Amino acid sequence: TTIVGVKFNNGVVIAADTRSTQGPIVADKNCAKLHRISPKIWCAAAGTAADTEAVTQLIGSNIELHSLYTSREPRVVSALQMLKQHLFKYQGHIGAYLIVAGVDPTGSHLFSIHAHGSTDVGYYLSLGSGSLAAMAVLESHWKQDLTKEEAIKLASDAIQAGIWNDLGSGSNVDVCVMEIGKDAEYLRNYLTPNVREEKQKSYKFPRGTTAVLKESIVNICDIQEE
Amino acid sequence: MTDRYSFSLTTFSPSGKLGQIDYALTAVKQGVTSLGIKATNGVVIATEKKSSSPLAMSETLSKVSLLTPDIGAVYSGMGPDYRVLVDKSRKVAHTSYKRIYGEYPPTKLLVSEVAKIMQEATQSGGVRPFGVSLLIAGHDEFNGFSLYQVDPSGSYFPWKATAIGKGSVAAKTFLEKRWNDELELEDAIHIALLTLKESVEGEFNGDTIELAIIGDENPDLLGYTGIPTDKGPRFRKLTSQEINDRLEAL
Amino acid sequence: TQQPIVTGTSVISMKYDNGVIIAADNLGSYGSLLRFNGVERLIPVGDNTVVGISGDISDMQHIERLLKDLVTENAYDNPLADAEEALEPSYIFEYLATVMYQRRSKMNPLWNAIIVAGVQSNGDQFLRYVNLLGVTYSSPTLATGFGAHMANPLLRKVVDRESDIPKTTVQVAEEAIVNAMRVLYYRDARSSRNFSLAIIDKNTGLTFKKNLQVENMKWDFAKDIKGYGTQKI
Amino acid sequence: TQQPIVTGTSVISMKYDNGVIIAADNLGSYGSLLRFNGVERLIPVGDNTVVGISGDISDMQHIERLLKDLVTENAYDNPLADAEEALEPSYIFEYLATVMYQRRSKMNPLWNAIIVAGVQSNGDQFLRYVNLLGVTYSSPTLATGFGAHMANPLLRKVVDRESDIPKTTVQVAEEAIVNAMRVLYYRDARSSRNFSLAIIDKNTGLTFKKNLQVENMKWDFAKDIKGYGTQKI
Amino acid sequence: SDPSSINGGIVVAMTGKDCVAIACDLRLGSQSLGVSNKFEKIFHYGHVFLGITGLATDVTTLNEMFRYKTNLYKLKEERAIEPETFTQLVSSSLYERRFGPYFVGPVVAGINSKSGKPFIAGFDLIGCIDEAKDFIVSGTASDQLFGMCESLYEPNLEPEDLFETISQALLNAADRDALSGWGAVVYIIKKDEVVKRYLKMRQD
Amino acid sequence: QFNPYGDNGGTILGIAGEDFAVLAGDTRNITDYSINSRYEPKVFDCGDNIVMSANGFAADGDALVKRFKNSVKWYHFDHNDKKLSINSAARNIQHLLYGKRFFPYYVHTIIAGLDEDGKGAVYSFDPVGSYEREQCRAGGAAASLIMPFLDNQVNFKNQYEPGTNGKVKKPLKYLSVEEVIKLVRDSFTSATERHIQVGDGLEILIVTKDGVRKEFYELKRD
Amino acid sequence: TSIMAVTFKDGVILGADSRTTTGAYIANRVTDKLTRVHDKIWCCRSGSAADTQAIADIVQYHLELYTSQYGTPSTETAASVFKELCYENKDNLTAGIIVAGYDDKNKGEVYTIPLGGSVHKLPYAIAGSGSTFIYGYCDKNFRENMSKEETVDFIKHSLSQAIKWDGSSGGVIRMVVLTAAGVERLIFYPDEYEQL
Amino acid sequence: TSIMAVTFKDGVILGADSRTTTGAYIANRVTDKLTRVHDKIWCCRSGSAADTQAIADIVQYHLELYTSQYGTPSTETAASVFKELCYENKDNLTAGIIVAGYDDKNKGEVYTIPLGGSVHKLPYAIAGSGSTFIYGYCDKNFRENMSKEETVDFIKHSLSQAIKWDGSSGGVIRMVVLTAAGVERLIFYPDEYEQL
Numbered sequence A: 001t002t003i004v005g006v007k008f009n010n011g012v013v014i015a016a017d018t019r020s021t022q023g024p025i026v027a028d029k030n031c032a033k034l035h036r037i038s039p040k041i042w043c044a045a046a047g048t049a050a051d052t053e054a055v056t057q058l059i060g061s062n063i064e065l066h067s068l069y070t071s072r073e074p075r076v077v078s079a080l081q082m083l084k085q086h087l088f089k090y091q092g093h094i095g096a097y098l099i100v101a102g103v104d105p106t107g108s109h110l111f112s113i114h115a116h117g118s119t120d121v122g123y124y125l126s127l128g129s130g131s132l133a134a135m136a137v138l139e140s141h142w143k144q145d146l147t148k149e150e151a152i153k154l155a156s157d158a159i160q161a162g163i164w165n166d167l168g169s170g171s172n173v174d175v176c177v178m179e180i181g182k183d184a185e186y187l188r189n190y191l192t193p194n195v196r197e198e199k200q201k202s203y204k205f206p207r208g209t210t211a212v213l214k215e216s217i218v219n220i221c222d223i224q225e226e
Numbered sequence B: 001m002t003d004r005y006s007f008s009l010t011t012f013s014p015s016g017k018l019g020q021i022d023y024a025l026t027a028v029k030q031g032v033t034s035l036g037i038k039a040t041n042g043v044v045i046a047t048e049k050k051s052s053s054p055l056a057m058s059e060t061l062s063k064v065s066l067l068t069p070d071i072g073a074v075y076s077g078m079g080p081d082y083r084v085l086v087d088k089s090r091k092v093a094h095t096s097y098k099r100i101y102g103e104y105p106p107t108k109l110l111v112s113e114v115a116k117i118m119q120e121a122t123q124s125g126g127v128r129p130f131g132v133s134l135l136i137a138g139h140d141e142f143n144g145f146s147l148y149q150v151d152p153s154g155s156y157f158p159w160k161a162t163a164i165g166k167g168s169v170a171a172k173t174f175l176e177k178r179w180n181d182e183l184e185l186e187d188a189i190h191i192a193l194l195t196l197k198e199s200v201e202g203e204f205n206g207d208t209i210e211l212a213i214i215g216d217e218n219p220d221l222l223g224y225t226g227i228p229t230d231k232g233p234r235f236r237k238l239t240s241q242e243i244n245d246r247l248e249a250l
Numbered sequence C, D: 001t002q003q004p005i006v007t008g009t010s011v012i013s014m015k016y017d018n019g020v021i022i023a024a025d026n027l028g029s030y031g032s033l034l035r036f037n038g039v040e041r042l043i044p045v046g047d048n049t050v051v052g053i054s055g056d057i058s059d060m061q062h063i064e065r066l067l068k069d070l071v072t073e074n075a076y077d078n079p080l081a082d083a084e085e086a087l088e089p090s091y092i093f094e095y096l097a098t099v100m101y102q103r104r105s106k107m108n109p110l111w112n113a114i115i116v117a118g119v120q121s122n123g124d125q126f127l128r129y130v131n132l133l134g135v136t137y138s139s140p141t142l143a144t145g146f147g148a149h150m151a152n153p154l155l156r157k158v159v160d161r162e163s164d165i166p167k168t169t170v171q172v173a174e175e176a177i178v179n180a181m182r183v184l185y186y187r188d189a190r191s192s193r194n195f196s197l198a199i200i201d202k203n204t205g206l207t208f209k210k211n212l213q214v215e216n217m218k219w220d221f222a223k224d225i226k227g228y229g230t231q232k233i
Numbered sequence E: 001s002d003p004s005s006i007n008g009g010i011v012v013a014m015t016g017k018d019c020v021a022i023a024c025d026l027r028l029g030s031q032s033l034g035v036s037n038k039f040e041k042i043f044h045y046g047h048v049f050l051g052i053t054g055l056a057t058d059v060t061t062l063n064e065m066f067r068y069k070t071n072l073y074k075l076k077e078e079r080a081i082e083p084e085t086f087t088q089l090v091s092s093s094l095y096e097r098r099f100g101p102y103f104v105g106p107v108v109a110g111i112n113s114k115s116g117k118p119f120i121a122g123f124d125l126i127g128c129i130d131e132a133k134d135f136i137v138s139g140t141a142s143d144q145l146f147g148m149c150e151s152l153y154e155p156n157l158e159p160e161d162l163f164e165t166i167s168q169a170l171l172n173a174a175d176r177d178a179l180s181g182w183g184a185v186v187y188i189i190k191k192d193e194v195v196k197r198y199l200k201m202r203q204d
Numbered sequence F: 001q002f003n004p005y006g007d008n009g010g011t012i013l014g015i016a017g018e019d020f021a022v023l024a025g026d027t028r029n030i031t032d033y034s035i036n037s038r039y040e041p042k043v044f045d046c047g048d049n050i051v052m053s054a055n056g057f058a059a060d061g062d063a064l065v066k067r068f069k070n071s072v073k074w075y076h077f078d079h080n081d082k083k084l085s086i087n088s089a090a091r092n093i094q095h096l097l098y099g100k101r102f103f104p105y106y107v108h109t110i111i112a113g114l115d116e117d118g119k120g121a122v123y124s125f126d127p128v129g130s131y132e133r134e135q136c137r138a139g140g141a142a143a144s145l146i147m148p149f150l151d152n153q154v155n156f157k158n159q160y161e162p163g164t165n166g167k168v169k170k171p172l173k174y175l176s177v178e179e180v181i182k183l184v185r186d187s188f189t190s191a192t193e194r195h196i197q198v199g200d201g202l203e204i205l206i207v208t209k210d211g212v213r214k215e216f217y218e219l220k221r222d
Numbered sequence G, H: 001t002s003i004m005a006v007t008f009k010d011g012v013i014l015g016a017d018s019r020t021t022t023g024a025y026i027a028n029r030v031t032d033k034l035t036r037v038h039d040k041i042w043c044c045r046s047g048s049a050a051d052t053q054a055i056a057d058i059v060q061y062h063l064e065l066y067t068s069q070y071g072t073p074s075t076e077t078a079a080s081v082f083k084e085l086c087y088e089n090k091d092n093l094t095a096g097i098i099v100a101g102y103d104d105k106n107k108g109e110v111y112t113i114p115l116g117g118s119v120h121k122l123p124y125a126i127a128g129s130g131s132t133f134i135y136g137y138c139d140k141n142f143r144e145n146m147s148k149e150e151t152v153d154f155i156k157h158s159l160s161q162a163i164k165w166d167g168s169s170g171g172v173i174r175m176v177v178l179t180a181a182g183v184e185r186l187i188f189y190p191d192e193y194e195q196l
């Protein structure tokens, strides 16, 4: 997986590739790794896929209840604190490595969190198997006072580096932009540089090609009247 | 430093009455009037913001509460009992439903869970029943719009329209005359404001009235864009200005 | 079978229109200890070849002596030793690749990763890799260790395929190499600031640059980073 | 189950005619690193008992707090806390011995060897050992770690059996202890020159000596030692 | 020793034009010994179909578990569970055994009764969801099924064409796996009719 | 401890026609999750109208090909420039592989060419030298993905004549070179989608009576 | 990691490098290892990033609750809370922490807590992988009652050497000054400290 | 073991501690780790006592035979013979050797040979377990072209610190001075160097 976060002038952008794997096999070519914790707090996930989903949903559920209880819009530091304490308690066994970003009344924020429960602060971050390829691009092109357009460009370029150079990553680039005083914009399949070419041949079979022993109707309906 | 009250504090009397439930219903009768009306394309719930002092900021006290994005609740009776029930109702919507099925519960089942919590306070050791009646309005895909009442016993009933608390007998008669099965949501809001004016003594405006609807999806209130299936909350609390606009055409 | 003791980190390289560039830092690490700060890991062979070596330094010094002895041996009874029968990059590589695979096959490897960079007689660019296992491969960009993970992505943005090689000048290619060395200094815990760089061009020959430093570093944003989440000061 | 981290070496001790002497150096080692040079490992309890501790220093500090808390607890509702119901060496020892054996039996030991030295109410000398396993024993001389191997042989030349105790004065006994500490500094790689010594006498009470140094060392013969056999210069 | 390959078996699912297909082999074994040639791996709860590969005791246990849960769902909700909702229920149920998991590879298939939209999904043993447009594979010949599906599949196939494609994907994948085969079943699922077909295949 | 083996990934495919044979291989070379090269040739013209590939651990693969190429050279010297037949090449390769029975070459080898009757031939080897002639074979990382497809599309397995209930099999046919190359390209496009170690490029060597021809096609680079 | 805390005339100064490692990869080059547990009680962190963060978060909680009930805690008290957590959970923790603070009564104090969970009060302390390389240097160059400028230079020169020789240390040198005057943050970049 | 060799204006000086350990027992407290392989080529030994003695004995033999045939060997040549033995027998040896010598042509030279059998020519070198604690100190205090008295003090102060912090080092500080003037042996006792 390749996931990144990049801060800019008036907010923060996160991005991710869309490949999930099972051994050396690609299980899903259009995986969604940008998870919504709350409307303006989103995070990118790497690691054990079930764990990242379960952990984002649990903390996202508890963040929603906390928001209703306090009559306040959720804060990124709260999502961070609740995620790290949960992951620390499980001593690394919950294999969730996350980049947590968002906007709240305090401002815009960008953090990373690792499976053992350590967190870090930064203006640019990368995680997953393609994090070295992505960090190379980030270390070469990042500057202070980036615009929205520049940060989206830099984030997607950093994912592309992971797509092309890391065998763990591939397919498409997903982006989510969180700007202060605006709705968060989730851009699913922001780039699509890996469409399969047309096949040489059609493999549609003639009807009757497969040998059958028995046919029967399956009753899916409930017990009937009369 | 022991909880020794492991026995029921609500029991059957010789006449077959459960005294504490009846007495809880009496507490609900003393409470401020609240109502609910169901339209074809929506549901409205409403109540009076009875301010305990003019120095108090009545905006901070929310009698009408969001439970899920498509479900809202109002009450009559004891306010603190209502507040803790709203906390528990919000939580049980997640724990016993959303964390299992990945979607919010339908209105009737969330009502069922709240009802269960209120029943248990009517039978468990060392507790009194909740001194509230709730009106829960909501929408879900397969059942459409709905409106439910929940009493201190745990019993619940679906309503086309109803009222609870202080002037409920008079308010229910008023609604019987005005309600029909072809009402639009705006017509139901208009009828809700007319019904509620009868039970209010003092000032009657957007600052002393609390009103919310279960209506169309509000994508502008969602807070994010990019997922076509997530179209926004159907619950919306009307503003002070929005209420006053409709009071001029009253 | 052994374990590496004193070690050298990444060697990085690429092809450009008229030749090849190769680079490596001047460090010999002793585990986490940054023990030796003046170690040259680019070793020229003649005026047309540079062998860049990472991994065990004792084994590097052995390989250095093999190459030095190879030049001596090639000169024997060879009137064209400085002309048509001079050592080629392809000859030097194949020799090393033979030795590497022979040593792994005796379960006593030379614990190194090697990149041979040069220009052939006909002006063709030569760039090929070999390691302790005898595994060999060629590509428009090549890098060992951390450089494979971090330098290659950056260098491949300049030369992504064979057809990009004629379009890439020596200035653009050197710039890319120098930037890649900075990125490795930010991110590799067993790297140093000081490095050597070698250009082998078909026209201008062998240019060997010593005592280079990583410069134009960005650390200023560090002042604004406080705590690990909730700390405000 | 754990492993000891910061550690203290030998504690040595002996009986003499009117009391007991105990000593230990002021070092807290971190493996081969001689990390902490001001660590007190003799801890007095009242005016009649000194507990000398070796092994894990974190566990030593825990034991120190247990003893401090034991004095506080003994004073509670006790008008004779500074007289007939004061803590005795035998009481302090049995408490520690109980704790040590309980902790080993839960597979979570206090990783220490302990010598309790003192004088009882009736003037009798008290000297007894306990360790991480709960093993206990008494003898006219006692020592932990390297001290068992090197100090005991020397101290047993002064008091070889019970009948030698009345014949041994405080000057002779202290001299033997000070010499033993020098021998340990020559020969124990995890020792220091600086040490503390405590005398508990039935007449003169508790005398606690800090900041002592090993002195009168012989190193001069070292100049004459050259090579390892055949070297003459 | 590896619980996921003691008994053997495979499941594959595919989408078509206004239809879905789900298919499985019939083998149950104890490593090299073939025991049963009638061990079906596809179950249904109303109109939602579930295939399960892996350790056979857990296949049976999970069928009984999801029958239990979908029966209670229907009593309370007063409607049949949909594929999208059932998928989430499978995921929730698997993940609650995170550190002592069921050794299984489940596959959901069905048509949403309201929207009419074809739906398939797959899961790992701890409940991660793969919601594919095209196809889902599972079992000891999953590599083989991935290869067959990725080449043979095209979108928007009619029900009777989709039958041929999924059958050929299953059969040829099974014949390259020692622990799969011994018969096969194919379900063709449309909005209000479901046809079940037993395939003639080689019995080794 | 020192491990003398490694895995360089890659995937290869041999198909035999009536008067031709193809040997195809992807051009990607990898270790762990890194790409070493996007174009590192893996299928080689060995002379005498024989093409060879030894996929797996690339160092052992290169060593084996190098030794076989040399075996062809010395076969010419020792037997009066006689053409090494494909069957004879195969038996020679068995002895090269079995020579290292207790320290194997970690590769799957395929050779292709024409037999002594001019008919297309593909031979396939395990690491220690067991071999068999076949119409079809895929080897390497994505062999498990590709082989079942070839069983179905080259040898017509599990396919029957429509309307015969299920009792007349689809009759076996030789495929044209155009039809084989279509199956090769689709096999590798499919493998590239689902296997991380497969990609970058496809290089096909086609062997006929006229000689050895090459074709190259781009594959996805992710 | 290279960390140190040094008492001086006007108070105490904490210092650290900014490197976080996963194997030989530098996961964070601008890490802040100097963390606030109270207004004028800070700590230097070394060992596991997860463990030392978890501990520091718990200590910050304990001292916030101490302050609500009993007023400002002493540096000794803060060190005791760190110790209790490190000692009692010694089997499950990898944490090497230096605690430093300023009182008006006690002035500057430094407590070091190594792996076992022992406590040691010292005039100055050094810790982390890179500290091994500067025991010699620090012992020869430390004096008591130094000025602020002298103590900044002592830490800058010391950590410069630790960074130079330890591959696990690097980046910027962060410092935190604790005096009666308040809390001052200082940063020193590679171009400054490498040429020393 | 703590060992070093330092080039200076008039030549080179070798230094060492005198401790030999079996576990934590000090088997020899007056060890001589500075060994002659030729009149003016000496070495500092660290690692296995058996291995470094065996190697040094073989090197002394090789250089004696070199001298009989070809005259006085260079320091570089002596280092090469050490290297050959250490490199080729790397699997079976635990030897860390510093080679130091004086020519009239080349003046003072120092070569260090660590565990792998690599060679490194340096202005000065440090090695052994105790050297880790003085990298900082030695880097800050070394200058080229020092006087004899300055270089004796530099080694005395350096090994003093190495001894202070390393339990595996101790005893006396032995030194051997190599100049045109000849070969001088120096010894420094604990009472002298501890108070520095």
Ligand SMILES: *C[C@@](C)(O)[C@](*)(O)[C@H](CC(C)C)NC(=O)[C@H](Cc1ccccc1)NC(=O)[C@H](CC(C)C)NC(=O)[C@H](CCc1ccccc1)NC(=O)CN1CCOCC1
Pocket (backbone or CB within 6 Å): A001, A002, A019, A020, A021, A022, A023, A027, A028, A031, A033, A045, A046, A047, A048, A049, A050, A052, A095, A128, A129, A130, A168, A169, E004, E104, E105, E123, E124, E125, E126, E128, E129, E130
């Ligand atoms: C791909 C990536 C570049 O690594 C990136 O990090 C993504 C990010 C996700 C999608 C948010 N990660 C994955 O795709 C993981 C990689 C991974 C695999 C294995 C362990 C840890 C990480 N992929 C998955 O988690 C994968 C998702 C499926 C394909 C939908 N699940 C598995 O591979 C599963 C993990 C099981 C497991 C159990 C306990 C601890 C950790 C992991 N393994 C299997 O399914 C293997 N096997 C099980 C028995 O049946 C046959 C298959």
Ligand SMILES: *C[C@@](C)(O)[C@](*)(O)[C@H](CC(C)C)NC(=O)[C@H](Cc1ccccc1)NC(=O)[C@H](CC(C)C)NC(=O)[C@H](CCc1ccccc1)NC(=O)CN1CCOCC1
Pocket (backbone or CB within 6 Å): A114, A116, A118, G001, G002, G019, G020, G021, G022, G023, G027, G031, G033, G045, G046, G047, G048, G049, G050, G052, G094, G128, G129, G130, G168, G169
């Ligand atoms: C740099 C320094 C000298 O070590 C200094 O002490 C810093 C101080 C921190 C920033 C407060 N320490 C680190 O950087 C630690 C060093 C360390 C590693 C492992 C155990 C203890 C200490 N680094 C981390 O804690 C690191 C932070 C992540 C990258 C955000 N975590 C790990 O490396 C993680 C720790 C697992 C662990 C935890 C506790 C005890 C034992 C092990 N380890 C991995 O992820 C292992 N890694 C190995 C290579 O393949 C990938 C997995």
Ligand SMILES: *C[C@@](C)(O)[C@](*)(O)[C@H](CC(C)C)NC(=O)[C@H](Cc1ccccc1)NC(=O)[C@H](CC(C)C)NC(=O)[C@H](CCc1ccccc1)NC(=O)CN1CCOCC1
Pocket (backbone or CB within 6 Å): H001, H002, H019, H020, H021, H022, H023, H027, H031, H033, H045, H046, H047, H048, H049, H050, H052, H094, H128, H129, H130, H168, H169
């Ligand atoms: C002190 C120093 C810093 O280590 C310094 O390098 C000196 C330099 C010498 C004097 C030239 N080195 C020693 O003192 C070595 C340290 C060492 C120990 C073990 C392996 C390598 C180095 N000490 C010895 O060589 C020691 C000399 C004897 C006492 C005369 N020999 C041993 O300790 C012996 C070595 C066995 C061995 C040899 C080579 C590789 C691995 C192991 N070991 C034992 O006798 C073990 N001993 C353990 C405790 O129970 C008794 C047996």
Ligand SMILES: [Mg+2]
Pocket (backbone or CB within 6 Å): E174, E175, E176, E177, E178, E179, E180, E181, E182, E204
């Ligand atoms: Mg089979």
Ligand SMILES: [Mg+2]
Pocket (backbone or CB within 6 Å): A162, A163, A164, A165, A166, A167, A168, A169, A170, F221, F222
């Ligand atoms: Mg990729």
Ligand SMILES: [Mg+2]
Pocket (backbone or CB within 6 Å): H163, H164, H165, H166, H167, H168, H169, H170
């Ligand atoms: Mg010492």
